């Protein structure tokens, strides 16, 4: 599947994340996530604050509290669809995800 983490500005990145994958693998794989925010999928950190767009939110795995926990807690432009893509899993029909990226990404 396509994927394209959005910046603050604007600016993004483009990976190619599968049925299963990520977008916070693939994007700790393409040197997204260059930070040090991994919570093993534990849930746990907040350096992976992020915004899906709209488009690949309800498409891709719909995550429940815990993951409105650790978005919750992010201190950026919360959305309706924010999301930690730790658990968005790019499937072949979401190719093409939109991902947008906070300027508080704590
Ligand atoms: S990788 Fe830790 S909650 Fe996102």
Known sequence: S?????????????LDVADGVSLM??????????????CGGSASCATCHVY??????????????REIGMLECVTAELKPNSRLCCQIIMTPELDGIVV??????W
């Open 52 to 65: 899906v767009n709209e488009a690949f939110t309800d498409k891709v795995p719909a995550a429940n509290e």
């Open 2 to 14: 396509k994927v394209v983490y959005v910046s603050h500005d604007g600016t993004r990145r483009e």
């Open 25 to 38: 693998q693939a994007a700790v794989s393409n040197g997204i996530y260059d930070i040090v925010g991994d």
């Open 100 to 105: 947008d990226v906070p300027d508080r990404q």
